[PDB]
A paper describes a structure:
S. aureus encodes a 2,271-residue SRRP termed serine-rich adhesin for binding to platelets (SraP), that is involved in the pathogenesis of infective endocarditis. S. aureus SraP, a surface-exposed serine-rich repeat glycoprotein (SRRP), is required for the pathogenesis of human infective endocarditis via its ligand-binding region (BR) adhering to human platelets. We determine the 2.05 Å crystal structure of SraPBR, revealing a rod-like tandem organization of four discrete modules: a legume lectin-like module, a module with a β-grasp fold, and two tandem cadherin-like modules that create the rigid stem of SraPBR. Further structural and biochemical analyses reveal that the legume lectin-like module specifically binds to N-acetylneuraminic acid (Neu5Ac), which may mediate adhesion to host sialylated receptors.
Numbering used by the authors: 251 to 751
The structure:
Amino acid sequence: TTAVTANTITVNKDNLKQYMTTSGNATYDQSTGIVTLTQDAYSQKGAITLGTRIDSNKSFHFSGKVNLGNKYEGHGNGGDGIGFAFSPGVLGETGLNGAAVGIGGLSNAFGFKLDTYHNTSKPNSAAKANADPSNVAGGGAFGAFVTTDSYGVATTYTSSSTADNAAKLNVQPTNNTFQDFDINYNGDTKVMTVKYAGQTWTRNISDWIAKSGTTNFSLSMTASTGGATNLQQVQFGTFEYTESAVTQVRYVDVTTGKDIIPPKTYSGNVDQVVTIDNQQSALTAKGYNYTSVDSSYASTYNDTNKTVKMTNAGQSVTYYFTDVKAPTVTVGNQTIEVGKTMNPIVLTTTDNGTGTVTNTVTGLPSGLSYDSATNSIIGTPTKIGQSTVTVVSTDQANNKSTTTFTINVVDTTAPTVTPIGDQSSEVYSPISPIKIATQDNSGNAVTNTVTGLPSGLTFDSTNNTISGTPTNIGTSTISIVSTDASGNKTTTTFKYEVTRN
Ligand SMILES: OC[C@H]1O[C@@](CO)(O[C@H]2O[C@H](CO)[C@@H](O)[C@H](O)[C@H]2O)[C@@H](O)[C@@H]1O
Ligand SMILES: [Ca+2]
Ligand SMILES: [Ca+2]
Ligand SMILES: [Ca+2]
């Protein structure tokens, strides 16, 4: 087996903390997926960043909701807004507070902002942002693409097309409600489509990607307040992307080719050297011994130091282990009744491994068999006695155990006897012989003894009949005791009346 070197991941509210990191004033509510980036208070800054580089040769997609606040330019003291930034620089870094709207401060980056505070006059040098454009001045929050230069200075993107020009929001933030927000990037066309509360911005971003000097990016979502404020929040929702600059590490059963424990993904910046873990002690605890390392999908791997060096493309290292623990069968001793269909004895087996376990069974009583399909001893035992049953349990790695238990086939069921009706016949007349018919679960001989016979009548053990000529008028109770080989007994009776002619 071989896995992909770069996964296509979806970040959701439950795995968010596995893939992303909050910083500054940001907090997170896992039950709702709500990242609160700032509260409605002065001088706040909060961010969330994705801990793996995104490959822009593949599609990526944020689908969620955003609360931009409840006041904005010309309608309350609202700011600063929320920035969604894609940076060619290192993971974990965020843009600046203020007019930079979380994008200014990052070099050669691009992104999209929702901007509630119109910075009409030129921000100072330290703000790393040009003024907001005239075409969105005069009232209302607006949305826009943003790009930065090599000094980290943000320019709000404007154009002569309504497709991607900076534009006032159709749905203004008046009441702290969450609106639908979507950033969709198509890795085939390089077109980024941003949608906020039904309003769309669309642009081919091939040029900004080329200007950034790379095809793999660090994603941040950052909001701030200064003297102007707002509750600013992003709700997950989901973020889908394909990894760049990762190494996959798998822990694989050499016999089956299956993952023994979950694989691990290490992330870094391009050229970052990262130590990976072969998890030997965890595999040992699971009954596995180290076998080898295959690093053919990670040419940067150094087995002495256990390091890889991240590249744009994903790498993969596989550690192989061998299952060195035999399976266990637990089966207690059994007592079953001869000539009855037994309820199955399930040969309950457990094993530490990833493959198939095969049981082979010997020493079964006659009539019993091992059913593979149900892993059970089934059948009807035909013979009294005790057997030692041996079960040899073999896993796919050829670890073997053998277990024995006893099956005692017993007879505790008494014979059954066809009923004989009460009889009547004339004194001194020979009778039609009365047949005594028995059956038993042992399938073996039932022996009968008979008492209480009218005088002149005889029981014959050879063919189990009563016959003869009765010589006394009167009434008899004939008593038959039927015994199997095990000593189980049945008493059957009937009345015999000897009459006058
Ligand atoms: O309140 C506006 C007033 O405050 C100043 C600081 O003196 O700027 C702060 O407020 C702005 C809006 O929240 C931010 O853009 C800025 O980063 C923050 O320092 C004044 O510059 C501004 O006029
Ligand atoms: Ca602004
Ligand atoms: Ca095993
Ligand atoms: Ca019996």
